[PDB]
Amino acid sequence: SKAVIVIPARYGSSRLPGKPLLDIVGKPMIQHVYERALQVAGVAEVWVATDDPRVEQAVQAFGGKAIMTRNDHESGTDRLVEVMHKVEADIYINLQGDEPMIRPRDVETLLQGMRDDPALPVATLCHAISAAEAAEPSTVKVVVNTRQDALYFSRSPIPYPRNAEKARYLKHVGIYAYRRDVLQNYSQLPESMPEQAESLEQLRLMNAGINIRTFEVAATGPGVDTPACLEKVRALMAQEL
Amino acid sequence: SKAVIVIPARYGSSRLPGKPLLDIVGKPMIQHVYERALQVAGVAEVWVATDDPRVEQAVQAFGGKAIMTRNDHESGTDRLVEVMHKVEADIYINLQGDEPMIRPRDVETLLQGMRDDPALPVATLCHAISAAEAAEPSTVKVVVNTRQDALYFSRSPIPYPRNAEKARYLKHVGIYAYRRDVLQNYSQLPESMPEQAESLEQLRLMNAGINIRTFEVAATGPGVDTPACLEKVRALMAQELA
Ligand SMILES: Nc1ccn([C@@H]2O[C@H](COP(=O)(O)O[C@@]3(C(=O)O)C[C@@H](O)[C@@H](O)[C@@H]([C@H](O)CO)O3)[C@@H](O)[C@H]2O)c(=O)n1
Ligand SMILES: Nc1ccn([C@@H]2O[C@H](COP(=O)(O)O)[C@@H](O)[C@H]2O)c(=O)n1
Ligand SMILES: [Mg+2]
Ligand SMILES: [Mg+2]
To answer: Which GO terms describe its biological process (chain B)?
Structure first.
């Protein structure tokens, strides 16, 4: 069972142009994600899928591996599909390029989940959050069954607190592990109403009946979408030293 | 394929003490639900399940079949399990005792779905609603996939309207059809945190990986839960006789 990591890292960004190259305590963000991907055991290759020559140069300068991809993809998943046709693997792990506080051990948990059950199509992560936190539509909630399969991904606070002291909440951590066959059939899947209404691409998978198993991990460090959040990651990663 | 209908009828009610006996055009609500259940084709027997002798006498007075069940039951579905041990059937249909405007044709659609797919564990009903109607916690919402299977049920307005113009809402009609094996171990299913927080019995099935297929029907008549709606129901019900 060959497994590879692919890190979507487009140069463009609405809030932080050239995000991948932003310096964090001495190293460009994309490097922090790449080096940590390298600490994950059981993975044969780690790639940074980019669209700009500057990102590609930056990745090669610190020893990393980069692969150029179409500069008109609508999302990291669509770019991952392009990489799939080019890099042969049985399992592909999609790691966000703007989440440098990722924990290698967390990615191992994810991989183990795929290998312990070869029938599992997709796997992802999640961690506990308060009800106050679950109220934010910017934070995605996931509801799971006993086997930990996802029932639904929503920006609405679910489960609903009819009996609030009985409610337990979960934030979805955007890391994904995919079986090869799922990426091969991907471009054929139609966008679904829940997906367009919620603005949650993973819903496209649930629509088509493809199962996604979650795996709980401890609370995860913040991502880099805003200048404010960027200073947050710096202060955090620095002190971590 | 033997199919039977069981109508749970707990007496108590915070808002409407004794809903089942509440009169509607000269018939206890429970009668309207029973007579309509009798119009459903393909069903061999129709029972009413209660924990209160007052409801029991009321059903026998109009010549219906009534069975007494424990009072410690947590839900209607748990109550049907007790009935299951005594009343044999391949398929059990749980019809709410407080929705008198039920359409026999909709229950047949439900039964047809079970028979068309002998592998389907549970089937239920749903119908389109406005976003405004979906805001109410008392109205349960359901979100499905392309095979009409349910993804999740909630009192919360789902799907969340990030792009409000693309949100389409489906209201869950609380009628259920289950294979016998579903009930035989429904009361032995692990606790569902979602069930406990949302107070939705069907969530115990999802928590256990048991599939529930949805079937869309036309907008249904309101229910007798609030003194406000109870009047809308009498007006309509009487208007129907006309
Ligand atoms: N301990 C209990 C509680 C309820 N019931 C009976 O079960 C039926 C369904 O209950 P409901 O409370 O009116 O309806 C609910 C509700 O909460 O509105 C139950 C809930 O678990 C779930 O089945 C939703 C559906 O999602 C449809 O809304 O519907 C009623 O005839 C009620 O008397 C019972 O027998 N024993
Ligand atoms: N069109 C797109 C959109 C996002 N992505 C990647 O997906 C991740 C998260 O997306 P955001 O730009 O929205 O933060 C980033 O690593 C980003 O580079 C991509 O490679 N192509
Ligand atoms: Mg982002
Ligand atoms: Mg009701």
So the answer is: CMP-keto-3-deoxy-D-manno-octulosonic acid biosynthetic process; lipopolysaccharide biosynthetic process
Query: What single-letter amino acid sits at B72?
Result: D
> Are B121 and B210 spatial neighbours (Cβ–Cβ below 8 Å)?
yes
How far apart, in whole angstroms, are the C-alpha atoms of residue A86 and residue B103? 56
Q: Does B209 touch chain A (CB under 8 A)?
A: yes
Contact (CB<8Å) A197/B137: no
Q: How far is the CA of B139 from the centre of ligand 4 (A)?
A: 9
Q: Which two tokens stand for residue A161?
A: 């607190």
Domain A1-241 CATH assignment equals 3.40.50.300: no
Q: How many angstroms separate the CA atoms of A42 and A3, rounded?
A: 7
What was the elucidation method? X-ray
CATH no., domain B1-242: 3.90.550.10
Q: Which residue from B200, B217, B225, B230 has its CB within 8 A of the most atoms of ligand 1, so it is best to mutate?
A: B200
Q: Domain coordinates of chain B in residue numbers?
A: 1-242
Q: Given the DSSP bridges, would you call strands B45-50 and A169-179 parallel, antiparallel or unpaired?
A: unpaired
Separation CA A111–CA B188 (nearest Å) = 33
| DSSP symbols for B17-74 | TTGGG-BSSSSBHHHHHHHHHHT-TT--EEEEEES-HHHHHHHHHTT-EEEE--S--S
- Give me the residues paired with residue A6 across strands: A47, A94
C-beta atoms of B151 and A206 within 8 A = yes
Is the Cβ pair B167, A206 closer than 8 Å?
A: no
> CA A144: distance to chain centroid?
18
For residue A91 the two structure tokens come to 């399992």
Which neighbouring-strand residues pair with A47?
A: A6
B241's tokens: 């006789």
Instruction: List Cβ neighbours of A146 (8 Å cut-off, separation of 6 or more).
Output: B190, B207, B208, B209
- Interface contact A218, partner B, CB < 8 A: no
Pocket test for ligand 2, best of A7, A10, A22 (most atoms within 8 A of CB): A10
- Hey, CA dihedral for B221, B225, B229, B231, is it positive or negative? positive
Q: Are B217 and B127 in contact (CB under 8 A)?
A: yes
What does this entry list as its resolution, in Å? 2.6
Q: What's the CA-to-centroid distance between B97 and ligand 1, angstroms?
A: 9
